[PDB]
Every structure is written in structure tokens, then in C-alpha cells.
């Protein structure tokens, strides 16, 4: 299953297939498979309003503002590994939230109905 | 120029308040409803996650006291009731046609199959569970409802794998020398953990796992006196323990096809119980002890011990099964020491006198009385040591006591390797694509 | 959650992006979280079958029929509200929904198959 | 539901539309809807990794090899049925499923994030 | 003397005098996502090969 989320940065995106394949795979037990099956939906419930529709490592329009800790992007990315800037925007994760769906998704889904 | 992308990274390292399941493997109170027990050879070393532990502060153990407490009395529902007894038993001593001086020869009324007839047998009981009113009442009638186990089932420890709902992550350092907690570089992940064994005592834990090279003391805060102070021990140790009574267990219906067991006689070799252990192990043991108390209280410190101070011996002596009998052991030839100043502190064996109960109360829970059947033949049970409680009771000098009472403290001695992460995949870091 | 139901028509569809992100987020309390759990998943069955796949307010390419209560489609596009014209389209359901699958979903799924 | 399962091969794929509909519309009972709500779940798990996202007759670029039964592709596409060459395939199953997410979706999918 | 036939080992129970022993039929249906199958064809030896279905 989970492997190499230690000491690797960008990396560990190359292997995000397995990631999935083995994720979801009385009544005291019960309550799993309900919320376990609650997750991997209410994500890819609003994955499908993000704009990447199933699984592609995608980029959106929308920018990243620079306020978000703007700490060096093309350096940060490779050597200082994740659980450590996951903290570092874990503060700005809500307001990314409703900036998902109005740059692409009022603007942009609205502009190819124009034809 | 940044332009943010969406991810299913792997960080999801969060808390997990949770559900759980089991993986153990006759219809023996564990009744095997669990799941057939994988192979599972995935201890997948992790590299460098710096993590640490909370042993203290879990669910694992809050569902663990749970599980079993529930587990137990579901294998006790569908045995015989049986409260017709509880009416004016009158005893008197064991007679031996003359001697000097545990059991009592017990006069005794009960119903039959038919709702009229009565029934005036005799049987044997204990010391511990009758009491005077010469007329002498069940020791549980105050308030309780008596109930026979059935016999057919074990009381014995029977393996428990633990697996993680489909969705979460079992995680294990592999690391060394906690102090209860610790951020353990070292880690390997698991969907499923290793078999864990249904026991239950006091004072000693057995049949436990073993230490890495030493002692590991564990607690939360050394400097209160109220905590619970646990010793891993390195070097297990061999009790042998016994009922050397040859005994006779008869059968009788008290009513509508509900059977019941007494103990009918003995054959005539009355003796009492007891527990040996090696007089040379023992001392072995507690210079390991003292060896790292003089770490964490000073160089010039005297190390007392002492026995429980009083209350129930439930809470006093060792609370102890076996083999379908539940013991009461009297240790105090084991915390007769004191160990002086931390500077220049066999073919034998010691023995200790062992109680036998029938009328039990599991956790303390009160209402709940189960009864044990007397079994034939002799007893003989071997266990190892792995597991002590120590209590710091309230000049440098220092008395310890072999505390307990909580059960969870023995399940949390067993099962701090282990943490439950909740898994949310999802990460948003920004590149340059626009597009 | 929900709003602007009542008084508009057409500019509801502006906003049909906070409508599902909220939405699916002992025994007889168990029923719910299965067929609340049944529901986002049968019509998304089928939705994948009219050819949209993810969230896209979207065109397919089979036909409006006229026969289906043709009153001013620009006209009534803006003003009337919903609710008021679901009505009057509520008999032509089951029609439109074997018009799913045959129109684009029995010819045009088996034409890019012939390069 | 279903039909013409018996005597046809390839023609059963024109009619591949009603056969996913239909599908998936105490406590003993309650084992139903929770394993068949996982089914159309697990599968769609991996579907989403195929790359084919949605319901297309889809083709991926990842090569059948020639040592899985090499016999008459455009010959036996045709005349002999399904359930016969399904036992053929049935041990290369597992295979291919390292094989749908390594082709197309270790070197492909990083590949479009070059621009 | 006569006791009752099953006192050796069991307890009496009465049926509640309003319901009815009869056969009333039952329909089976399968599960969401599973299929009943049957054949229409003719003369199994128990088991058998049936090609209408
Ligand atoms: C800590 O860990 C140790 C081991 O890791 C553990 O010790 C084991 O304890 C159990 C239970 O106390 C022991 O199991 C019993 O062993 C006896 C003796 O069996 C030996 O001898 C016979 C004949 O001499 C051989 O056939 C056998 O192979 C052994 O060599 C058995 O008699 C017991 O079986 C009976 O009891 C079971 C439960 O009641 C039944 O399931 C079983 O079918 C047998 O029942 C029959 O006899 C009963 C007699 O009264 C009768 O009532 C029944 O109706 C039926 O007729 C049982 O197997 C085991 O040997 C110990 N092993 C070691 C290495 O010591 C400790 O118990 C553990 N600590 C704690 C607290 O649990
Ligand atoms: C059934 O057997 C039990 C024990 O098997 C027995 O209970 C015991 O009875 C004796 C005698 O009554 C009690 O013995 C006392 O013990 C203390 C300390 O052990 C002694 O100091 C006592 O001696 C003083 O008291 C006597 C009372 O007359 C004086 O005669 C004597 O000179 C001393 O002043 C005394 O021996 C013993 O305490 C109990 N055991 C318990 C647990 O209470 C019981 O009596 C037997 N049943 C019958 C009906 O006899
Ligand atoms: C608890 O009981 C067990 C067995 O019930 C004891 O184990 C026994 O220990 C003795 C010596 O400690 C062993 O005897 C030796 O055996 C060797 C091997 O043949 C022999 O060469 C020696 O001369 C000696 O006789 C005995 O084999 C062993 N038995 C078993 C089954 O392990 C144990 O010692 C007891 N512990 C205590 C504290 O009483
Ligand atoms: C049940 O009745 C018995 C009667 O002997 C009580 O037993 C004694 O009670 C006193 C007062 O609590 C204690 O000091 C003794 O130690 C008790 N004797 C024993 C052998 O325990 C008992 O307390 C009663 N229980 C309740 C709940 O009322
Ligand atoms: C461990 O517990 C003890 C007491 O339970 C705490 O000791 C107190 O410490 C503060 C400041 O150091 C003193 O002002 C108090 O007087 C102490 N309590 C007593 C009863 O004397 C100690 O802080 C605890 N340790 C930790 C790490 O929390
Ligand atoms: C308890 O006392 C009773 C007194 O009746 C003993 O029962 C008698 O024992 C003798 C020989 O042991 C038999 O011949 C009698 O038939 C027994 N009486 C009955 C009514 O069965 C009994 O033995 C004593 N208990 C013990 C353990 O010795
Ligand atoms: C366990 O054994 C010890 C043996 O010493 C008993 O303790 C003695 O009890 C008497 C009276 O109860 C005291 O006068 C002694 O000072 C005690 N000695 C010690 C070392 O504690 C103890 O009562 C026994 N406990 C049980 C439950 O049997
Ligand atoms: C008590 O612990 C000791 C640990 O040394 C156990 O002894 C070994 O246990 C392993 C696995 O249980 C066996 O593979 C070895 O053969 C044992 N060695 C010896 C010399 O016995 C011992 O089994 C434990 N006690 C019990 C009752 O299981
Ligand atoms: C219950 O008690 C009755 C007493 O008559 C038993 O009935 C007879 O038992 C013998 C021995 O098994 C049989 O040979 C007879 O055929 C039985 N009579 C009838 C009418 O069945 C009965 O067996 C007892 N049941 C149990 C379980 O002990
Ligand atoms: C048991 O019952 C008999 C009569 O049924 C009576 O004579 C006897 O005293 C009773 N025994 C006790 C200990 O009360
Ligand atoms: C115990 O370990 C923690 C970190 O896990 C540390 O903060 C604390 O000082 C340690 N205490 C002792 C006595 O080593
Ligand atoms: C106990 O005594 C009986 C005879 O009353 C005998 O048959 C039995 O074998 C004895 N028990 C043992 C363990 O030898
Ligand atoms: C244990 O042994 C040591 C020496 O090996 C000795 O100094 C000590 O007194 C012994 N313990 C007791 C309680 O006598
Ligand atoms: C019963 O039918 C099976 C095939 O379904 C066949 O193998 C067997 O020989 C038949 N037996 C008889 C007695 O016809």
C-alpha cells in the first residue's frame, strides 16, 4: 500500500497509483464501509467542481496567490519534503476551497456555452 | 507566477478516532467472528518519519476494554440463570473423626425438575464465598443475580490479530527504548497487526511479549505518586502453580432441564494451593530494577517494596486464572526487599500460598455474579512473567507497592507499539501550468 | 446550502456549484447514509451515460423535440421560473431518458471507434 | 436487463447501454446495498485509472502482447462468443492490470504536465 | 403418576392462538447487482447441462 512518503518530495507523486488501487478495497463493524464509503465520494464529490474530472496529476487556471507563504516554489519543491509544508499551507486549505469553483467554474463553465 | 494543481498525494498523517475489527482466525467465548486470518507480510519499512507516540492517550485501548467486556457476556447469556439457591444454607466445618483445623460441609434445600418436590443434598463449598447469618448465606445475595458459566468453553487466552477498517492505516515503530511516549525515526506500516493473547490479571502480567536488552519502565509523570508505574521486563520467568486436590464433581437438574455442578467430595489429601518460583531468577530480576531507578530518582536513593496495603484482595493479592479456575494468590514472599543507597546493595525455591474462589466479579461491575464450575482431576498450569505494576507510594529513601485494578493498563502494556491514522488524500501544490 | 429557488430563472444556473458540495456531506438511523448514499450514485449512473461525465453545465447533440410543450424558448428561458415550467415538463421525463441513450450513446459512441 | 449474452460476439457490445441502468436500482438484508454499493464502486476505482473515465468503447495505448493467446484477432472477434474466450483470458488478468497503470499511466500522465 | 413427556430437559411454550399454520407463498427476489437464473428445459438427472435458460 503506502511506501515513500518518508524522505522524497515530488517524487512520491510518481507513484501515485498505488495509492488508490488498494484504498477501499454486527453493527459495531457496520459503521465501517458506510463512512469508508462516505470517503473516496464527498472528495471526488467536489473533485468533479475542481475541473480535473477523474485521475490526472492536472493543473487548473486559477492562480496561486503568492500571500500563501511564498517560499521559494521551484526550490521548496523538490528538496524539503511533504508533512512539513503540509503544515506550512495547512492554514490556507478553506479559502483555496471557494477559489475552486469560481475562477474556472463560474467564469470558465460558463464561456464554452457560448457557441 | 504560480498556478495551483491538484494532487492524491500520500500525507494524511492525521488522528484517528475510530472503529475497529479483529483477525483471530470450537465455539470458545472468542466464537472466531472475526475474518479468516491473512499471511499478511507487509510490515513496509518506512524511511525517516519522525512521529511520535501517544500510549497514554488512545482509542485502541478504550475499545479494546470494550470489546472483551462485551465479548465475555455475550458468551454468558445463553448458560443457565440458576438463582433457586440463594435460601438458608446452613454448613459446618469438614469432619475428620478428630484432628485440628477451607471447605465447609454445607446443608442444603433446592427444587427438582417438578415445580413441588424438593430436594435436600449436600456439597462443599469455600471460605471466601459464604457468610455467617449455624445459618450461612451466599456471599452475593446483598445484591447480585448468581450465574453458572457453561462448561464447554475455555477460559483460555486465544490469539487476537487486529486489522484496520478499509480506508485507515495500522503504524508501528520498530524503534527502541520508549519512555512511554517518544518520535520514533524508525516506522513500518501494517494492515493487520499480531495475534495478541485474551489475559487478565494483577500485580504480574503473563504470556505477555518480552523487552529488547533491558528494563523499561513506563509512566506518564514520575514525579506524581498517583500514576500507575509499569516495568517491561527482559527475562521471563517459569511459575508453576496447582490445586492439589483430588476431587469429585457430581451432576444434579435443579428444574426444567437445567443442570448444575457441585463439588460432590475430595478423595482425602486435603492441601491447600500454591505457585512456586525459582528463589535465584528472582533476585536476577530486581537488580535490573533498581539498576535504572537509581536513573531516574538519584545515586543516593533507598529502594523499599512492601505488599499491597488492604482493600479487596481482588485489589491486594494477584488475581489470577487457570485452566478454568480463577485463583486469589497471597505474594507477599516477593516484595520483601529493600534495596539500600544505590551503591553496593539458589537450588531453592520460594512458595506461595494460594485461595480459591467460586463467586467471581469480573471488572468490578456489580449486579453481574458468575459462578465457576470445580473440575476434576488435578491443576497445572505454566506461565511466563513479562508484565509488573508499581506504585509510588506517597530523606531520599523510596517504598514501592505492586499496584493494579484497572485492566486497561494491562492491555495498554501490550499494545503501545501501535498507532491509527485517519487517511485524507488530497494535496494542492502549486507549479507553472496556466493550462 | 440552498437559495434563490423562488424568484429567477436561468441566473439559478450561475450558481449551481454550491448545491452539491454540501450535499451528501442503531438501525433505524441506518437507512439514512444508504439510500443517501444511493442517491448521488443512480443518477450519476446514469449520468455518465448521457455523455457529460463530470459536472460541466453542458450541451449533448440529440434533439430537442418540439412536440414537448414548444412555448418561446428565449423568452420563457429568463422570465418564467422553474418549478412552474418543471411542471409542464414533468410528463415528458422518460421520453428524453431513451432519448439518452440512443441518440449520442448508441450511433456516436460507435464512430470514433472507426479510425 | 440483460439479453443475447448466449449467441453473438461483438454485436453484444452495440447494446452494452442497458446493461449498467438497470444495475444497481434487518440486518441480514442489510449485507445488500453496502457489498453491491461496493461493487460499481471498486471497479470504478480502477476504471478512473484505466484512463477511459467515463462509459466510452474506449481504447487505451497500451500494447496487448501476442503471447496471451495469439489467435485470429479479427477472426474469432467475431464468430466465437464470449464465455469461450473468456476462459482463454481468464489466467492474463492480473497482468494486465499492472499493465493499465504503468503505460499509460506512469509515463503518459507526466507527460502532458511538461507544457 | 404421570409427568409430562419433555420435562427431562426443555421448557413449554404456547403458540399465540391468532396466527395460522399456513403456507402462505414467498416470492424471492435477487439483490441489486445479482441475477436469478432458471431453466425452462426438461428432465434433469439432478444436474445437467441445460442449453435453454
Ligand atoms: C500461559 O500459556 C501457557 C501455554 O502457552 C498456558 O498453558 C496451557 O494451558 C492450557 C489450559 O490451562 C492447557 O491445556 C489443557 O491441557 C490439559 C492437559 O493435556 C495434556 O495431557 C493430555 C493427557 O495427559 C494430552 O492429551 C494433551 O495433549 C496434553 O499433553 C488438557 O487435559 C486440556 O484439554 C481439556 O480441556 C479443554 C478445556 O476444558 C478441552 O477443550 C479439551 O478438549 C480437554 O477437555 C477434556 O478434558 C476435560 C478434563 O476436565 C473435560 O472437562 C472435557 O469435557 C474433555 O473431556 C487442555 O488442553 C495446556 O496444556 C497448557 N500448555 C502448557 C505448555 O502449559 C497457560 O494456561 C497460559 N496462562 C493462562 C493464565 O491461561
Ligand atoms: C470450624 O472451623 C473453623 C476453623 O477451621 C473455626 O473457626 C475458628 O475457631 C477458633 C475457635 O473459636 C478461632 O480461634 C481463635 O483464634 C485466635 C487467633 O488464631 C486465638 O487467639 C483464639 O484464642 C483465644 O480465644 C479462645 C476463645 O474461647 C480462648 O479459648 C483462648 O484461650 C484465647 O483466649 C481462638 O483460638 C478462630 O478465629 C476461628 N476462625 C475464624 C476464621 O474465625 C470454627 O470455630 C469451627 N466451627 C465450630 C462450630 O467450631
Ligand atoms: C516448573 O515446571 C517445569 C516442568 O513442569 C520445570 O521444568 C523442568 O526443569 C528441570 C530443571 O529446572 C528440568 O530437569 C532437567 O532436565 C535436563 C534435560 O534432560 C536434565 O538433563 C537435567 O538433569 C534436569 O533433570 C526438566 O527437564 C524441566 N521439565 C520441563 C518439562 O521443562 C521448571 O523447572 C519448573 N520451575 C519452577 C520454578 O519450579
Ligand atoms: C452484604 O451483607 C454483608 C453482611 O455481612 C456485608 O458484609 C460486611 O459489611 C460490613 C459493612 O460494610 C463490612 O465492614 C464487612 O467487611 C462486610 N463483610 C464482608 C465479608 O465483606 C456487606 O457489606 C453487604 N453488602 C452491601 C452492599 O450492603
Ligand atoms: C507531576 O505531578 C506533580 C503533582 O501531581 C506536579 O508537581 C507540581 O509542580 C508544580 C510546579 O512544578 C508545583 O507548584 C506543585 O506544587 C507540584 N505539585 C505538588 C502536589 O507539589 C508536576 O508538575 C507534574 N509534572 C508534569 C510534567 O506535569
Ligand atoms: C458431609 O456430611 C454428610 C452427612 O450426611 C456426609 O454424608 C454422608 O457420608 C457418609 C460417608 O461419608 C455416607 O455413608 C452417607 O450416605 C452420607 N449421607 C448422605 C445423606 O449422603 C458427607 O460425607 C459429608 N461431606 C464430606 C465431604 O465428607
Ligand atoms: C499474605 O501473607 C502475609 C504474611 O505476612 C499476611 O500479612 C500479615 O498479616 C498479619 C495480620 O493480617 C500482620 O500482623 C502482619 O504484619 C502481616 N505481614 C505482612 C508482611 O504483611 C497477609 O495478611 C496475607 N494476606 C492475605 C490476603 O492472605
Ligand atoms: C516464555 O518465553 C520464552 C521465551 O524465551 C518461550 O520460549 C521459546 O518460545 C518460542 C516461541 O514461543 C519457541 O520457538 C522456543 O522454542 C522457546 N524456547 C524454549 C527454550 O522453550 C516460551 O515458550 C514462553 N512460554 C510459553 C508457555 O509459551
Ligand atoms: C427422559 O425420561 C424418560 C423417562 O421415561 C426417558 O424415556 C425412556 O428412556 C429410555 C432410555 O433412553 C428409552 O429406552 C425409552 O424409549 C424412553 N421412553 C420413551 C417414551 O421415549 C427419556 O429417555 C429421558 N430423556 C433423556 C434425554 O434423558
Ligand atoms: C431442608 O428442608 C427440610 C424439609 O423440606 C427441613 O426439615 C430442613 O430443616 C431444611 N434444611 C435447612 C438447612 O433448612
Ligand atoms: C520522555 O520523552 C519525551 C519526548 O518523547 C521528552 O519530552 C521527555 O523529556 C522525556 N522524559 C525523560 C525523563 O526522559
Ligand atoms: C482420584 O481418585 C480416584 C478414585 O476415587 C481415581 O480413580 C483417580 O485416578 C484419582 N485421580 C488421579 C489424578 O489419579
Ligand atoms: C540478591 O543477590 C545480591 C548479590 O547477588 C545480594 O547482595 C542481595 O542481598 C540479594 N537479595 C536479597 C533480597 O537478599
Ligand atoms: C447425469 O448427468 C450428468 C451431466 O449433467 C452426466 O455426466 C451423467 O452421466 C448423468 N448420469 C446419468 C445416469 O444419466
Redesign the interface.
Given at each position: 500500500?503506502?511506501?515513500?512518503?518518508?524522505?522524497t518530495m515530488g517524487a512520491?507523486?510518481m507513484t501515485?497509483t498505488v495509492?488508490?488501487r488498494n484504498?477501499?478495497?454486527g453493527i459495531?463493524?457496520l459503521?465501517?464501509?458506510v463512512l469508508?464509503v462516505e470517503?473516496?465520494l464527498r472528495?471526488q464529490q467536489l473533485?468533479g467542481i475542481?475541473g480535473?474530472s477523474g485521475?490526472l496529476?492536472?493543473?487548473?487556471?486559477?492562480?496561486?496567490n503568492?500571500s500563501w507563504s511564498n517560499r521559494n516554489?521551484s526550490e521548496i519543491?523538490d528538496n524539503m519534503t511533504?508533512?512539513q509544508?503540509?503544515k506550512e499551507?495547512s492554514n490556507y486549505?478553506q479559502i483555496?476551497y471557494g477559489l475552486l469553483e469560481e475562477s474556472q467554474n463560474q467564469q470558465e463553465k460558463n464561456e464554452q456555452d457560448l457557441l | 507566477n504560480?498556478?495551483?494543481?491538484?494532487?492524491?498525494?500520500?500525507?494524511v498523517?492525521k488522528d484517528a478516532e475510530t472503529?475497529l475489527?479483529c483477525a483471530s482466525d470450537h465455539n470458545v467465548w472468542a466464537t472466531h467472528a472475526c475474518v479468516p486470518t491473512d499471511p499478511n507480510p507487509?510490515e513496509?519499512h518506512?524511511?525517516?518519519?519522525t512521529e511520535e507516540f501517544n500510549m497514554w492517550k488512545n482509542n485502541m485501548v478504550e475499545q479494546m476494554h470494550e470489546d472483551i467486556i462485551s465479548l465475555w457476556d455475550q458468551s454468558l447469556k445463553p448458560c443457565v440463570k440458576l438463582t433457586p439457591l440463594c435460601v438458608t444454607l446452613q454448613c459446618t466445618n469438614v469432619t475428620n473423626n478428630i484432628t485440628d483445623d477451607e471447605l465447609k460441609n454445607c446443608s442444603f434445600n433446592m427444587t427438582t425438575?417438578?415445580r413441588d418436590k424438593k430436594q435436600k443434598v449436600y456439597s462443599l463449598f469455600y471460605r471466601l464465598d459464604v457468610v455467617q447469618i449455624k445459618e450461612y448465606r451466599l456471599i452475593n445475595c446483598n445484591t447480585s443475580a448468581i450465574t453458572q458459566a457453561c462448561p464447554k468453553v475455555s477460559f483460555e487466552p486465544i490469539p487476537i490479530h487486529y486489522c484496520a477498517?478499509?480506508?485507515f492505516?495500522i503504524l508501528k515503530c520498530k524503534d527502541k527504548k520508549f519512555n512511554g511516549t517518544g518520535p520514533c525515526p524508525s516506522?513500518s506500516?501494517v494492515?493487520c497487526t499480531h495475534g495478541i493473547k485474551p489475559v487478565v490479571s494483577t500485580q504480574l502480567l503473563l504470556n505477555g511479549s518480552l523487552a529488547e536488552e533491558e528494563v523499561i519502565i513506563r509512566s506518564e509523570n514520575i514525579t506524581n505518586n498517583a500514576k500507575n508505574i509499569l516495568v517491561q521486563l527482559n527475562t521471563p520467568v517459569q511459575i508453576n502453580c496447582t490445586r492439589p486436590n483430588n476431587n469429585t464433581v457430581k451432576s444434579i437438574?435443579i428444574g426444567?432441564?437445567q443442570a448444575f455442578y457441585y463439588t460432590g467430595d475430595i478423595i482425602g489429601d486435603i492441601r491447600q494451593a500454591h505457585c512456586n518460583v525459582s528463589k535465584a531468577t528472582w533476585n536476577e530480576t530486581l537488580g535490573k530494577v533498581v539498576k535504572q531507578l537509581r536513573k531516574h530518582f538519584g545515586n543516593n536513593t533507598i529502594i523499599r517494596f512492601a505488599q499491597s496495603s488492604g482493600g479487596d484482595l481482588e485489589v491486594t493479592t494477584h488475581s489470577f486464572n487457570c485452566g478454568g479456575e480463577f485463583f486469589y494468590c497471597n505474594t507477599s514472599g516477593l516484595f520483601n526487599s529493600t534495596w539500600i543507597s544505590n551503591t553496593s546493595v539458589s537450588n531453592d525455591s520460594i512458595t506461595l500460598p494460594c485461595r480459591i474462589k467460586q463467586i467471581i466479579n469480573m471488572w468490578q461491575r456489580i449486579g453481574q455474579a458468575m459462578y465457576a464450575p470445580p473440575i476434576q482431576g488435578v491443576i497445572r498450569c505454566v506461565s511466563n512473567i513479562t508484565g509488573l505494576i508499581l506504585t509510588r507510594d506517597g530523606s531520599t529513601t523510596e517504598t514501592f507497592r505492586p499496584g493494579g485494578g484497572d485492566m486497561r493498563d494491562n492491555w495498554r502494556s501490550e499494545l503501545y507499539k501501535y498507532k491509527v491514522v485517519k487517511?485524507?488524500?488530497?494535496?494542492?501544490?502549486?507549479?507553472r501550468?496556466?493550462?
Open positions: 500500500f503506502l511506501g515513500a512518503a518518508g524522505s512520491a507523486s501515485l495509492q488508490a484504498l477501499l478495497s459495531k463493524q459503521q465501517a464501509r469508508a470517503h473516496y472528495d473533485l475542481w480535473c485521475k496529476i492536472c493543473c487548473t487556471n486559477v492562480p496561486w503568492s516554489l519543491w511533504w508533512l509544508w503540509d499551507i486549505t483555496i | 504560480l498556478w495551483v494543481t491538484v494532487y492524491y498525494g500520500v500525507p498523517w472503529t475489527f507487509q513496509i518506512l524511511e525517516n518519519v425438575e417438578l477498517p478499509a480506508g492505516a516506522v506500516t494492515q437438574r426444567p432441564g487517511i485524507e488524500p488530497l494535496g494542492v501544490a502549486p507549479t501550468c496556466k493550462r
